[PDB]
Amino acid sequence: SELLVNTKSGKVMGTRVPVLSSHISAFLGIPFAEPPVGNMRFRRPEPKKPWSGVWNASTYPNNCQQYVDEQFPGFSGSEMWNPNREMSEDCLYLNIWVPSPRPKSTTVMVWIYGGGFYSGSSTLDVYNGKYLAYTEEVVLVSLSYRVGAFGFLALHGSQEAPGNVGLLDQRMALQWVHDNIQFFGGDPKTVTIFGESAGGASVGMHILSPGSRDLFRRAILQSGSPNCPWASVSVAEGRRRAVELGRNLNCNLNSDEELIHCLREKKPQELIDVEWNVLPFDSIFRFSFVPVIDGEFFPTSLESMLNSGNFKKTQILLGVNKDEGSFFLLYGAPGFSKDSESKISREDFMSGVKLSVPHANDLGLDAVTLQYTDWMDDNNGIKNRDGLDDIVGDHNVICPLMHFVNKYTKFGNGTYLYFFNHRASNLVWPEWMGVIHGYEIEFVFGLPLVKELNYTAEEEALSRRIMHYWATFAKTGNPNEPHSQESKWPLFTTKEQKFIDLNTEPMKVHQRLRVQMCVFWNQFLPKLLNAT
């Protein structure tokens, strides 16, 4: 049977699912690690021990314990990102979509959801992997990993809560894929890991980490890169936060042993409820428990590894969306509302840049402000809104990614950069938010191909070319089909620095994506701040 598979660990029974007037195979909730529960909470994940009999893999598994967004209850625009299954610590599972009839040894794509390393689920409606698998005939894998404290509590020196275990869960799902994807018609030698936001950062951390390097061939990073300011902390910062987490729950703080034993006695939701209390400053686009530069999963600073070319050499495809910042300003900055134009006064702009660049001293904030203010028209609420938007998106996403692409390229074997700037005709968020962080995803997953979701014809077409670029990149390492008559996404090179827009207009090639502002964020500000 097409739906029964003999994996290394045990047998698996999938389910046939309809997809655009056809069908394909799905294997949902397949375990790839022993449940990280009880005294195992905060520990490195252990391989799932073999099982006898058939594993029912016909339904999505649990989502990991995480903070649920309740800003807009019942609003589809936000809840579309919330867990849609029972949360549980027993959440280490992956999902596979296999074309029917089963392919021989085809391209694999592994999806690593984002969500600031504090949230995310593999089961969301926007991650339904059937359309992409079916349309591009690839084997699509959806993995999961512990988020928040559960996946990132870092008490360096301790083997009970070493940190980076959520990144280690990802690696184990990858190893799983490497050991078994062949039984599903996938080529373990041609696996592309791709992810958005903390998912794009994860992908890049696997490109850097020596222990993850050989578990994949190529990589795709969307709206996130490993060196993002919010994607990692030092061992000290990691330890301070874990200690503060304990102080927040009246834990014994004599030793890591006692602190850790204490935390393992708290119910999940108890940790979640104080999770945000450990951050250094009041801010936006900052998350509590994230990867740590431990000298193990990450041998040295991300920067030195990047400067010395100490990373996996291969082809990467990555890009950003036009308004990566709006989502965050809406949730945590004064002046912004989802029920208005959110025109920002000069006062709100000032408090806004402070909430956005939390680590900056006075001189630093002055420089940012100077950088994003039109002093001829400084009371213009629209300019102030768009100004703060760009601040948040340039600082947290775009410039850190450009820094990364520019470094990676000196050593890599092929880079393709994109700027997604298409505002969906059916977006549920207000107009001022633009092409929001996370909204190219529905195009990558081909949701526009399901007529009942009301996308325009041209949107279906955009979705089809994006999936084709992705899959084609995945199979070959170049998004372009050889000897094709269509316009060509050119190679990004350190000398030319070319990239394309991704929208419904005919492709356009541009150069030096946001250089001005990125020269500021990547070179100048860092210096100004170092000078102190």
Add this chain to the structure above:
Amino acid sequence: SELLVNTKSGKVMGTRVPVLSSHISAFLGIPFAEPPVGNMRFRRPEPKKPWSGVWNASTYPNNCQQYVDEQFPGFSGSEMWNPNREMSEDCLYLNIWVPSPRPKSTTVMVWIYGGGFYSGSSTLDVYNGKYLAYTEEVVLVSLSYRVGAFGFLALHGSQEAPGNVGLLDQRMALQWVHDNIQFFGGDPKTVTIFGESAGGASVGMHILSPGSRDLFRRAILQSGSPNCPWASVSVAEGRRRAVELGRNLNCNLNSDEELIHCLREKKPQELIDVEWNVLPFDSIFRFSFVPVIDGEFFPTSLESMLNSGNFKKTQILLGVNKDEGSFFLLYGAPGFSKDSESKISREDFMSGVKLSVPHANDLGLDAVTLQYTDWMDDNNGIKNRDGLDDIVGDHNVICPLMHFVNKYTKFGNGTYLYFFNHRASNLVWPEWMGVIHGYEIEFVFGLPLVKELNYTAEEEALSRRIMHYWATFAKTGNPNEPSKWPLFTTKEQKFIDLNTEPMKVHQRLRVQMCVFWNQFLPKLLNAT
């Protein structure tokens, strides 16, 4: 006679001079102070001792000892600024242009030449005051003052070379006008001091200095203000340079009096020959001997005086020209040439910014560069040129003056700001240089009216209105006679363009770049 005048210090005989198919009286080289020579070198000026008989004021006096420019021998665009008379240390004279028939108690305008405090003359063809006096019926005065070491050698604490004597010379010329201009038909209660560059700066120093306030009514500042980076130094920096001059002429440096007596024994040119060697940085738009914040001519810091409103409260009219920096890049920056578009490479740009902002550290230089560079097209030679042309102009002239204008307006009684962006049709300098530092002057003095100088008909008209604004301001404190030039206010910050096209009103003159230069960069440099 109309040409014979009894002054307080003595009798003076002027001379009749033609002007636009007509005539007016001219009184040239009237002495307003004892020649500051010999033992008097570097000292405060002493009032001119009265004389018996009649003083021959029919020809221009000597120009003060100064570094003559030889960058372009023969070339008129540069030589028009060099001394056109013999240089001497006996150079403290002033010139008066009086309309004929002699007016009664009329408006006076006193001109103060510039040239970074190291040069300048009262006799240049472009300062001939006959056109302005005749056309507007004002008594026009051009005074002079010691420049370079002779006017600003500063060994604070000594009476042999206290510093600021050149500013004290200007002040004495003002006292003279105050005590005598009435005898020439001028109203001492309606004296306007105006000047450009070091001259525009001087004007502001007299607005600041308590000792100079009651000697004039109003002020006009052209492309210069007191707080310009190049217009002053501290008592220590002043002393450091004075000592370094001695070290350069192998002088005994045991004490101030000894160092001084030694500098007095040198021939004028010997001092001039080592003048630039005392600058601490390798740069442009920087001059060796300049005013010193001594606590006497200037009570406190220029800024504290500005913040506390400690200065003369009156009306002021000032402005800048579009391309202040070009003159300076041409002379001292690589890449620039009088005979080419002077397109600048990225490398000549980096060095050019280091030459323009000599005090800033690396972080500072980065902020400057970041600010004036278009990174999507960083190898554009024209943007690099125009870009460097703005740095030097914004830093040295435009932003220091906008800072001044905004501090002054908080306490003042009326501000009028202009932006001069017309390029003379007959300019001898290359197009890339634009509207150069000092070229509004020919318009303020109405040279466009003398037909043989070949200015367009519309340039004569631009000159005519500029002169009328100046004189009308001088006379009433408002350049408008009952299209208006609106008042500048801290809320609106309005100013006008001064060109051939119909007047246009703008707001917030170069606010973007000046927020950088006046607020951000200073802070950056202090912190780091």
